[PDB]
């Protein structure tokens, strides 16, 4: 699966 990170 696809992954975001919003620090
Ligand atoms: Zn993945």
Do not use: E, H, I, P
């Amino acid at each position: 699966g696809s992954n975001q990170n919003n620090f």
